[PDB]
Amino acid sequence: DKLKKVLDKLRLKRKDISEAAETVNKVVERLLRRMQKRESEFKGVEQLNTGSYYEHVKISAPNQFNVMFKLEVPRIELQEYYETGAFYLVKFNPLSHFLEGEVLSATKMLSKFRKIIKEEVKEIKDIDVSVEKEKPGSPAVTLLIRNPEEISVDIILALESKGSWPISTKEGLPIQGWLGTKVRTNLRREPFYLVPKNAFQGETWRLSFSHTEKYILNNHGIEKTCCESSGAKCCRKECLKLMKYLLEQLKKEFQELDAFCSYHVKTAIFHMWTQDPQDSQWDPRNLSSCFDKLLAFFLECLRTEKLDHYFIPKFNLFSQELIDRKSKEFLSKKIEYERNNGFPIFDKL
Template identity: 35%
Template sequence: MVVQDGLTPRKDETRGKSSPPRLTPARQRQKVKQQPSEESSLVVEQSVSISPELASLIKRKAKDLKIRQTDRRWAAEVVNDFRENLLRFLRSCTDQPLFQSADFLTTGSYFEKVKIHSPDEFDMMLKLQVPNRLTMTELDGGLFYRIDLIRTTRTHIQAFLLENQRTLSSSKVLNETYRLVRKFLKNYKVPDECCRWEVNRKNPYCPAVTLSLCRTDKNSDELISVDVVPSLEVQGWPVPVRNGPDVENWLGKKVRQEIRGLPCYFVPKRLKGRNLSEDAKESWRISFSHIEKKMITSHGNKKTCCESNATKCCRKQCLKLLKSLIEGLKQRFPKELEDLCSYHGKTVFLHTLSSRFEDSMWACELLPSCFLQLVSALEDHARRGVLPHFFVPECNLFSPAIFPRRALAFLVNALEEQQREGLPLLKHPLPVARLRPETISAEVFTEDDDQSAAVSSAVMTQLVLLFAMVLFGLSFLIQSM
């Protein structure tokens, strides 16, 4: 599998927060499910007044978020080589037969073509084959599960069972992935000799083996980050998500049926909290990143939207802008908005696509108004404290258990300020250095460096003049003697 220039969570939902509790009672769940579509339809009917300056800023920012082709090609070369060689190593690794049949599934923002600034983050789901007959026991709101075999087995999966010989251990699978990746890196060399791969410290709540590509210099900055996420490919969805996402008006009934017919994946992510039960310590979280990729890449109500000779839309540009705004908010208020992540914006985006499904609503010339409506939708969800998971509506991503009320109120005020002040966070983008190691040191040259160079030049000039005067004085004294 090859990373192509035009293609993809990072971070996706595998890096999201723990699953929120259910929204109860049942009447409340129905009301919450219907409310976004009603409010979104009202937003569509309202005329949005946008100043020419703000419209120009949004369009210019959308262009600035594009990734440099030179960075894209270099990153693709490095990441492809790593992935292909790792897969070759796993298939020839006799000490762990389960991983010999593994394969990669590309997911995340880069392969959805909504990555912003730089191709510096990649997600790779390492698919592991498991028996078809499994029992998936829901642990928390429809996202976390305990996975058990219906029958005892003597297959390769046996090495990753708990003492009861039925329950699949998420910690054992993740630990073995760490071991194999470290073993692989001992003899692997990056195509660019100036770089090396490093395995990051393990995070108890992260389902991935995270690697950083750094220069061979000591204490160098990270150039690229890669998440290798072991996952179980399971045929048949668990009961809480069996109906599939609500995309009939947007993508059609056939696409919804196709989505429901796809396998689902479980990643080794444990629930957060103290005094966890044994089941919670060995929990698996269901992942929909492969379906999110399918929906975002084939996003049109009409099947030809954004194809080579078809009408273009601004959907992906709006998502990129929203991701940029969220990134800017987190950088400006790191403590207050610690719980905010790009997946919240992605969820709002998917809900908006499902309610504003006509391609004409996303025409390219409507980019400023479409983006502002997306920002307003995020603010509205935060104000109400309700953001249903797109695939598991009973899970509230703005639940107080995972998104504190104080942080939610701060987010509402920050979004109001941004809209009132004309989106100032989009006016002052942070400088993005090129990825290639040989160009980074030459391009990280700021205005402060210019001033320092000017001061140094002036000092050197004065020293030279002083030295010349001393020499002249000495020569005069020698002649007079």
């Protein structure tokens, strides 16, 4: 019971999955063909599906989809922004119209990308779909879809580089004692990605490891058979779902928590999965203890004001410059409260 029943509630319905995906795939496919069918500065982008729905940890409803349109760009030089670790300027075609002083401007290229999508969305007459107003500094072009429910799709332009990952990641991805050195070496043989976030704030990109995280979510055990048809279930994803849910419920209720996001939870459980690598440490019979030790770890992160980017160890997602101490102390109070009272926020609608 208890947490088992909560997970029963969070579980997506097969029918809703079917109806959401088919409408999502209609729009995405149409947008994707537009990007190459034309001259178009983004001819050659490929679709990369990412985030919780494609990692099978989406909760409640299939109402948010994350898609990367990635562009392979060769002979790119990276300059780390302000020792931040995650933010870079990039330098040396149709992309000529996006540079400046030899700097590929994230802002300029996102704007044309965005302009294309808006135009194509205008030609869609079979689906009720609009482009959400732009959020400054965001990497996303966000679609809002109606019909069987509200659905949002974040279309994320990404650059794809095939060289060695930037030195700031050298000490990241510390999976050696959990997924192992062969897996780590192979993952770092994959490309890395750059996403037009902006900390020259307008020209900066941010590193993305959404492809690495997806692999990890679907290949998460120390045993190769974890959660496979001839292995045993673990409760790793279910703990992620529960913690995601506690934060979503807390964020709905308290504006004091706007600065928090699900990626903070994702980052925290990557660290917990590294600290507790054995699959037996995530036995489904120990769901409550597992959820609790995740809570305690997350609270220790808040208390110490320290949650390092799992791929970029020096980039503290909980630094003062990013999240006010007051916000972190508010979230500590609310989590400790739910914890010490049987999670009442889990009962509510």
